[PDB]
């Protein structure tokens, strides 16, 4: 407990932490019910909802789009304007590269942010508040509830989609979500940097206004049951920068507490 307070002070930041060992139900919590802008971590839950609504076959449906659909960060989507991309390809881009237009196209396919909210409430998430598209969802002022969640809610929702208990997705679809998250390219300095070598990691990162820096993950020991955790952080000033080391260090504290 005092370890997390010490970390907060070292990085001039505020932490929100929740971790659950699914094998023992042992938990690690630090401000687990405090709201933070969820930022791109929402992309994992958006895909979870997409997977509840579409068959594996239906993920092969090609989605056409134009340059008018592109936003501020389109690493993959900008390359396929001419042909379009399948729902499978869009989910890959959104999760592995944090492609913003890919998230927006998926969000439109599932009915928009209000539909994502309804589907999250249906799985029992009464806290996550989807409201906006990318990148405007990153513009959260402290005190606002729009486009925010908590460490506890994000772990609960991530666990619901990714794991067999409480299996909100069938096995084949869970496998897809886990595979994409395991092959994420954006989180090497976050949760991945705080877990021991040999443990497998499936994560989704996010960064937003007020120096918000987040990472949510499912982590596996070489042998045994997974840990689901969320490490969220923010700062007092609008134009504050973040340090990935805060997340990596907070992950190290969590792992000590769990082992």
């Amino acid at each position, epitope marked *: 407990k005092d370890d997390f307070a010490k970390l907060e002070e070292q990085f001039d930041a505020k932490l929100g932490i929740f971790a659950l060992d699914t094998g023992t139900n042992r938990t690690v919590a630090y401000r687990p019910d405090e709201r933070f802008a969820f930022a791109s971590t929402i992309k994992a839950l958006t895909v979870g909802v997409l997977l509840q609504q579409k068959s594996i076959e239906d993920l092969n449906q090609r989605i056409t789009y134009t*340059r*008018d*659909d*592109l936003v501020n960060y389109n690493p993959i989507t900008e390359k396929h304007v001419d042909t379009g991309m399948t729902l499978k390809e869009l989910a890959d881009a959104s999760l592995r590269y944090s492609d913003n*237009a890919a998230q*927006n196209l998926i969000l439109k396919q599932i009915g928009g942010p209000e539909s994502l909210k309804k589907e999250l409430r249906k799985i029992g998430d009464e806290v996550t508040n989807p409201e906006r598209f*990318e990148p405007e969802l990153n513009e959260v002022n402290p005190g606002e509830t729009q486009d925010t969640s908590t460490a506890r809610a994000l772990v609960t929702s991530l666990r619901a989609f990714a794991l067999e208990d409480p299996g909100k997705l069938p096995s084949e679809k869970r496998e897809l979500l886990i595979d994409w998250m395991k092959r994420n390219t954006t989180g090497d300095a976050l949760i991945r940097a705080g877990v021991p070598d040999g443990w497998e990691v499936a994560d989704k990162t996010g960064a937003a206004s007020y120096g918000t820096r987040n990472d949510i993950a499912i982590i596996w020991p070489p042998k045994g049951d997974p840990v689901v955790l969320a490490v969220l952080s923010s700062r007092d000033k609008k134009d504050a920068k973040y340090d990935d080391k805060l997340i990596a260090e907070a992950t190290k504290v969590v792992m000590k507490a769990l082992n």
Partner: nanobody
Amino acid sequence: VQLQESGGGLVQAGGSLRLSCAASGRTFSNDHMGWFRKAPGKEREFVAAITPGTEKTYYADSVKGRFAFSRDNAKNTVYLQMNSLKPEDTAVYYCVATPYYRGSYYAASTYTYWGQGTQVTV
């Protein structure tokens, strides 16, 4: 119905321009307004966006701190005050509108009402 943009043209680096977007045919007071720009050769990019109620403003990083989006519901006009103009700001400025939030403010496909555009030179 039409959206006509004025206040653009010949200006020096570091100077200021106030772009005016005059509406006609219908009231645009309940509409989510915005600005987009297109430079010769360079791709069309988002500039600014404003909501109808609370009037929340959204600006591109490339324009943030220098530009200011403001409304005038009575005159059926929206304004874009551009300060500390850079050679980078040289483009054709388009006034955009949508009655509802159908997508991202940064996405051109989100706007159902488009203007003819006004030339801005630095």
